Amino acid sequence: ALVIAFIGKNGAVMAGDMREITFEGEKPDREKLEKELYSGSIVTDEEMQKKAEEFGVKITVADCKEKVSERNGVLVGEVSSAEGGVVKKRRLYASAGNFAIAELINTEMTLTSQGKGSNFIAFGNEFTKQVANKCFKDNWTKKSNLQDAVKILILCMETVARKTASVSKQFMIVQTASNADVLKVVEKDRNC
Amino acid sequence: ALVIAFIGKNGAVMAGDMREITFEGEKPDREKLEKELYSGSIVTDEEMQKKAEEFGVKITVADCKEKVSERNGVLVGEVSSAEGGVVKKRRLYASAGNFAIAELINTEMTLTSQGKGSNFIAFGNEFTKQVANKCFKDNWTKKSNLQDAVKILILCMETVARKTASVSKQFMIVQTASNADVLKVVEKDRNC
């Protein structure tokens, strides 16, 4: 689906949809259907289920996976793009000026990026990630601090609330005052 | 593994170990090994791994699954006794005087018990559940309110901290003042 964060001197903003989707049926079919939703081709949920009995899939939903959490002045988000055997997670930590992104298999944690400074990020299905990328330039100028960007995230969250079905229509957003050096959280998660 | 709660007029106490265990290898073997740990036959973790290369299993661990949580004056605990395809959860809600236990498959939530009044409960592997049952009578008299029982849980938590390896040596305990009518939490989880 999608979740997004922004990092700067003032603060950090992380917004995430709460939708998780369960796929049951011919696994070759599942990757045949999965294509179409990821590619972004439908939005209405009635136009979602339509196709499903065309291909053979039963698809339980609940728009309340808590895709971001606020552990201690750092905001954590995470996409469970599971696909089959077990677990395929993919998580971020952010604060004011500090930021990193990690890829999880099951228990195992693998990093992919870090550092300090200023950034805008998202994770998703290919399409959802693209639509956030549209909107962030849309409404973003360096002539903002946090405060505008916080609204930006909502429009973008609406924008793909609007134009898609892989993303829970309810969504949750959290903020930090703190330049917490997010680096530690990852080591604690690894000992865990 | 194990987690335990006590319910009375004053309050509720829920204590849970944080250990989750990952099983990799010949699935027929896994149920062959799983027997022995559940039955309770080992405690030291070096005497844990020993047997594993005897049978062919790689077993990643982390003693920090958050087996209980405090959502709003009600304490929730949950054993993920997964065994294979997907998810086999099993959860409780408790407060001061009110209590219920639900069985989860994946998304789906099934109840098994409810009501109001006074109780002592646990979930686990067969052995761990038994050892808590020992200890609760050990140190329990109706001539207690909460306050003793809160310590009881620790000894029992130590007692199977002690005498077993399926249970994380670190553990977490939470308490409520409130006779919150735990009933609505199950319905909220179902809409979710």
Author numbering:
A (entry chain B), B (entry chain A): 1 to 192
Which of the paper's sentences describe this entry?
To this end, we first attempted to capture MmCET in both its apo form and its peptide substrate-bound form. In this conformation, cysteines in MmCET form a stable intermolecular disulfide bond (C65–C193), locking the enzyme in a dimeric state and constraining the crystal lattice. Interestingly, removing these cysteines via site-directed mutagenesis did not affect the crystallization, and ligand-free enzymes were still observed in the same crystal form. Moreover, volume analysis of the substrate pocket of the free MmCET structure revealed significant potential for designing more favorable peptide substrates.
